[PDB]
A paper describes a structure:
The eukaryotic La protein recognizes the 3′ poly(U) sequences of nascent RNA polymerase III transcripts to assist folding and maturation. Human La (hLa) is a 408 amino acid monomeric modular protein containing three structured domains: a La motif and two RNA recognition motifs (RRMs 1 and 2); these are followed by a largely unstructured C-terminal tail that possesses a short basic motif (SBM) and a nuclear localization signal (NLS). The LaNTD contains the La motif and RRM1, the domains required for high-affinity binding of 3′ oligo(U) RNA (Kenan, 1995; Goodier et al., 1997; Jacks et al., 2003; Alfano et al., 2004); indeed, it has been shown that the two domains must act synergistically to bind 3′ oligo(U) tails (Goodier et al., 1997; Ohndorf et al., 2001; Alfano et al., 2004; Dong et al., 2004). We have solved the crystal structures of four LaNTD:RNA complexes, each containing a different single-stranded RNA oligomer, and compared them to the structure of a previously published LaNTD:RNA complex containing partially duplex RNA.
For the sequence AUUUU, the bound RNA oligomer follows a wider turn such that U−4 rather than U−3 stacks on U−1. In this case, U−3 is flipped out and makes no specific contacts with the protein. The U−4 base stacks directly above U−1, rather than in the offset manner observed previously (Teplova et al., 2006). Moreover, because the U−1/U−4-stacked pair pack closer to the La motif (probably because the ssRNA ligand is under fewer conformational constraints than the partial duplex RNA), this now allows U−4 to make a base-specific hydrogen bond with the backbone of the La motif. Thus, atoms O2 and N3 from the U−4 pyrimidine ring are bonded to the carbonyl oxygen of N54 and the amide hydrogen of N56, respectively; moreover, the side chain of N56 makes van der Waals contacts with the U−4 base. None of these interactions were observed with the partial dsRNA ligand (Teplova et al., 2006). The LaNTD:RNA complexes involving AUUUU and AUAAUUU occur in different space groups, C222 and C2, respectively, making it difficult to distinguish the effects of the RNA sequence and the local crystallographic packing environment on the conformation of the bound RNA. Moreover, the spectrum obtained with AUUUU exhibits splitting of several resonances associated with residues in and around the binding site (32–34, 38, 55–60, and 140–145), suggestive of a slow conformational equilibrium between two states, possibly reflecting the two modes of binding observed in the crystal structures.
Residue numbers in the entry: 8 to 191
RNA sequence: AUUUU
């Protein structure tokens, strides 16, 4: 277990960077990918903060992916560069789709300003497949305590949004669809 | 060029 859990964290992080949600908004990455038919050096990858926190060891990152479930990433011949499989292009961002991403967006208020992505990640663990967590922030770049969660499907969004209890382990939360939130 | 580069 504990090792397998960690190798999965490694995978999911790399897969989030190159994911459908994050890549379109990742100028640094979008750039790197243009320099070599999409390949990016693990030497530059270990630079990413959240990945680095887990490991800076190239082989470890390679075993972790070699054994992925999403199978969205590609490892190079010399096992030093990785990339998003060309056979898995990014979506055609249409209005029908920009709209559907909104319907899958939920707002939650009541998170201790001193909570981290892993605190929020942990709590969401068994509440539905999520594609993105947005920690809202002030001007001083501080965590407002409120966030935006994007789920993989409306079904799990609606199930979530429509659950009574919804208390953050002791505290109580405000849970609305990103849409309503703008009744402000 | 770290708002999960």
């Amino acid at each position: 277990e504990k090792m397998a859990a960690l190798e999965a964290k490694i995978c999911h992080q790399i897969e989030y960077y190159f994911g459908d949600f994050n890549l379109p908004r990742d100028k640094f990455l979008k750039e790197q990918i243009k320099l070599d038919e999409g390949w990016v050096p693990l030497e530059i990858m270990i630079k990413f903060n959240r990945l680095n926190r887990l490991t800076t060891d190239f082989n470890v990152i390679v075993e972790a992916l070699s054994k992925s479930k999403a199978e969205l990433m590609e490892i190079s011949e010399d096992k030093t560069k990785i990339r998003r499989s060309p056979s898995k292009p990014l979506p055609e961002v249409t209005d029908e789709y920009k709209n559907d991403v909104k319907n899958r967006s939920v707002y939650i208020k009541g998170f201790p300003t001193d909570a981290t992505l892993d605190d929020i990640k942990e709590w969401l663990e068994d509440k539905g497949q999520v594609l993105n967590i947005q920690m809202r922030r002030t001007l001083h770049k501080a965590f407002k305590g409120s966030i935006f969660v994007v789920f993989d499907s409306i079904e799990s969004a609606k199930k979530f949004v429509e659950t009574p209890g919804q208390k953050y382990k002791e505290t109580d939360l405000l849970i609305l669809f990103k849409d309503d939130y703008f009744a402000k």
